[PDB]
Homo-oligomer: A and B are copies of this chain.
């Protein structure tokens, strides 16, 4: 079950989410990625940001080496972090990711965020410690550098993440554009279903990839603990009962049936193996309209901190 991307490549519609907070030992990423592959996940989502590309890659390489999978069966995503937006930093950042994971190519490379951050090396030992420094980069030139990565065979497909419609149009309207982004990976779930942005993406042949599809990890560092817990929704629970599934499985299936490619992070063996059951059942059209009704414009990514960045996607 794969979707055809606008560059002709194919992306599995269910992806494994690998991010876990820095308290979680990195050896866990190695363990759980092997478990994900053993359960049937083939699309694996990582990033320079996650500090896990080595462990994730070693999982992949391990399952390739022992003959459970071929490299060609695995669809591996990495992402260009925001301190590397300047065009001359793009290819080395990809190369660094490739060396960490010990892969020859990534199946997909994304611009992680339109919110560029100061690159390079400070120069004093402490002056800038702790601060968050924004940078200003024309993301079109970032995108050209991405296009060159694809032409070098380093990334099979290239795309973006956390872009809004305006930011997508800026790439789409670039003079001399060679490759459209294949996807826009954004927060998407029944509390923030992104239907308008989805319609836009579909009209341009860009796949929407949903993160926090199960309602986020609710990380204390950001997420308001009084925000409603997605998987406790009564409509999601009643559909789970009706179908003899679970609220997670309902929420994942919802995305698949609206043409969205869905990620699901779990570091728990049983939930990982549950999540692959998404292909065993289907929601009715009426079920789908009921889930559409749950939208409350709720972003679990309380980016509030970054709200004054000129490229903040919700300004």
20 extra A-B contacts, CB within 8 A, seeds A12-B226, A42-B226: A2-B226, A4-B296, A4-B298, A7-B304, A8-B224, A8-B302, A9-B224, A10-B224, A10-B225, A10-B226, A10-B228, A11-B226, A72-B220, A73-B225, A73-B226, A75-B226, A131-B151, A151-B304, A151-B305, A153-B304
Q: Does chain B have a CB within 8 A of A150?
A: yes
In the assembled complex, which residues on chain B have CB atoms less than 8 Å from the CB atom of A150? 304
Per-residue contact bits, chain A 224-253, to B (CB 8 Å; 1 contact, 0 not): 111110000000000000000000000000
- A167 shortest CB reach to chain B, Å: 21
Instruction: Please provide the chain A residues from 1 to 53 with a CB less than 8 Å away from any CB of chain B in the complex.
Output: 2, 4, 7-12, 42
In the assembled complex, which residues on chain B have CB atoms less than 8 Å from the CB atom of A151? 131, 304-305
Interface majority SS (helix, strand, loop, mixed), chain A:
loop
In the assembled complex, which residues on chain B have CB atoms less than 8 Å from the CB atom of A70? 225
Query: Can you sample 26 A-B contacts with CB below 8 Å?
Result: A2-B226, A2-B227, A2-B228, A4-B296, A4-B298, A7-B304, A8-B299, A9-B224, A9-B226, A10-B224, A10-B225, A10-B226, A10-B227, A11-B226, A12-B226, A42-B226, A70-B225, A72-B220, A72-B225, A73-B225, A73-B226, A75-B226, A131-B151, A151-B304, A151-B305, A153-B304
Per-residue contact bits, chain A 274-306, to B (CB 8 Å; 1 contact, 0 not): 000000000000000000000010110010110
* A contact residues vs B (CB 8 Å cutoff): 2, 4, 7-12, 42, 70, 72-73, 75, 131, 150-151, 153, 220, 224-228, 296, 298-299, 302, 304-305
Listed from nearest, the 9 A-B pairs whose CB atoms lie closest are: A10-B226, A72-B225, A2-B226, A8-B302, A10-B224, A10-B227, A9-B224, A72-B220, A151-B304
